[PDB]
Design a protein around this ligand. Structure first.
Ligand SMILES: CCCCCCCCCCCCCC(=O)SCCNC(=O)CCNC(=O)[C@H](O)C(C)(C)COP(=O)(O)OP(=O)(O)OC[C@H]1O[C@@H](n2cnc3c(N)ncnc32)[C@H](O)[C@@H]1OP(=O)(O)O
Ligand SMILES: CN1CCC(CCCCc2ccc(S(=O)(=O)Nc3c(N4CCCC4)ccc4ncccc34)cc2)CC1
Length: 411
């Protein structure tokens, strides 16, 4: 039983999803005027709050809530510690809607107790290529293609209820109130990811990580150990030797991205992302926002040959609190973001990402097996983690697809 999810416009079982052939809406069509004007009722001790993401103190409140109460892994070894600067970046992209950031505070003392964030995204989410094929053989092309145009929808992230308030059914109210504010803007679909299984993903992929600072990494789980390394003499030396990387990028032509690279980066990224079934469409302002280097937050490099950008990669920083281990309390992780390769194999481009991250002091590089991320796992010594990222739509029927048909990176 899902007392909440059974009431929502999502496919209810894997079986139902396995039946889906064309992209399209689940719900009755509705209009903005059908949607309540007033926020969803909540207990009189609580209030709704729309944080001002331009206010340092509002970003700090969100930061603290997530630092202490956001996502942990299954064994509670790590909890994400998104930084304030990271939050301001992720929550405030071009044309963001301040009303879509939704918080619940205790009225008496203004303690933040819960948060959910929506940002706008323009997403391709029409019927996948493999079904557009079944549709032709069968004579139904126009129907299969009806929703091919990129849609301006909502991307949901940072859902978080304070640990003191867990299992009190607060998450459904947050989700209902966000849905109301997005629908009041004449938006009827959302996309979201989670590490938990809910009804019902259209895709799921494993996490993969690449050790950059193995001495620290093995210590968090906790020398001896790894099992396979004990079996010889200088095991720490063998671990360091296995994961060592060059001090400097190998690709001549590599350099940090600059504002004048925006058009070229936009073009080579959009030609690449277009090949996938689900993927975002970015304007120049969105490329500038999500890809231009920002200290501590997002790191982007291009390969430039004869003043032409031919390849690029990006990664962003999310440190995690290390939970029990006393010595090291933060793990500095670099996450593979968007990239495009036209002049060199993908593994050669991403080796430079690992070199740069390592040189900048990151301990590990992490990613999900979306995009073409599988194509460099073995050669660059990534290993599968224990997590799986599931992709979801709200109010959108969508066939099941492989994660290598997904091009949307969620922060
Ligand atoms: C058109 C616009 C639409 C916009 C909205 C689109 C939908 C957006 C949907 C949100 C996408 C978020 C994307 C991310 O940010 S995924 C990251 C989510 N955050 C965390 O994991 C942080 C740590 N955990 C918590 O803060 C809480 O445990 C949360 C908040 C997750 C649950 O709070 P709590 O543990 O106190 O439980 P409750 O008693 O209040 O509520 C229980 C109900 O909640 C359902 N539940 C549990 N986990 C999730 C989850 N990750 N997504 C959606 N639903 C979830 C659960 O199945 C149950 O429903 P049902 O089984 O009874 O039916
Ligand atoms: C948009 N948005 C929504 C929330 C979604 C939930 C997170 C998915 C769960 C989820 C994410 C990732 C993993 S993991 O297998 O990579 N383990 C973790 C690692 N590594 C493990 C060993 C090397 C470093 C390092 C740091 C971590 N920090 C926190 C949690 C796990 C972490 C395991 C589980 C993530 C993305």
């Amino acid at each position: 039983a899902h007392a909440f999810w059974s009431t929502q416009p999502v496919p209810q079982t894997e079986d139902e999803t396995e039946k889906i052939v064309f992209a399209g809406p689940m719900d009755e069509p509705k209009t903005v005027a059908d949607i309540p004007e007033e926020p969803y009722p909540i207990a009189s001790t609580f209030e709704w709050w729309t944080p001002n993401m331009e206010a340092a103190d509002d970003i700090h409140a969100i930061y603290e809530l997530l630092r202490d109460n956001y996502v942990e892994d299954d064994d509670s070894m790590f909890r994400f510690n998104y930084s304030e600067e990271f939050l301001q970046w992720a929550l405030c992209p071009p044309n963001y809607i301040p009303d879509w950031h939704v918080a619940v505070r205790r009225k008496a003392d203004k303690k933040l107790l819960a948060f959910i964030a929506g940002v706008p995204v323009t997403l391709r989410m029409g019927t996948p290529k493999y079904m557009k094929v079944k549709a032709q053989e069968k004579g139904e092309g126009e129907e299969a293609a009806k929703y091919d145009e990129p849609r301006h929808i909502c991307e949901i992230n940072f859902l978080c209820v304070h640990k003191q308030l867990r299992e009190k059914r607060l998450a459904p109210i947050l989700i209902k109130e966000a849905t109301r504010r997005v629908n009041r803007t004449n938006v009827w679909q959302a996309v979201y990811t989670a590490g938990v299984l809910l009804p019902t993903p259209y895709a799921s992929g494993q996490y993969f990580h690449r050790s950059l600072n193995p001495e620290k990494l093995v210590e968090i789980r906790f020398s001896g150990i790894p099992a396979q390394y004990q079996k010889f003499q200088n095991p720490m030396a063998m671990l360091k030797r296995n994961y060592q990387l060059p001090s400097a990028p190998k690709n001549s032509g590599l350099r940090e991205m600059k504002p004048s690279d925006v058009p070229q980066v936009r073009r080579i990224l959009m030609n690449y992302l277009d090949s996938f079934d689900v993927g975002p469409v970015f304007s120049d302002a969105e490329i500038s926002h999500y890809l231009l280097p920002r200290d501590g937050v997002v790191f982007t490099y291009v390969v430039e040959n004869d003043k032409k950008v031919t390849d690029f990669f990006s990664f962003y920083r999310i440190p995690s609190t290390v939970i029990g281990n006393s010595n090291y309390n933060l793990l500095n992780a670099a996450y593979v973001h968007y990239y495009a390769a036209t002049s060199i194999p993908l593994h050669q481009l991403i080796l430079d990402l690992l070199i740069v991250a390592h040189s900048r002091g990151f301990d590990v590089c992490n990613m999900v097996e979306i995009l073409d991320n599988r194509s460099f796992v073995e050669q660059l010594k990534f290993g599968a983690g224990d997590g799986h990222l599931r992709y979801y739509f709200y109010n959108w029927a969508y066939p099941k697809i492989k994660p290598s048909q997904v091009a949307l990176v969620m922060l």
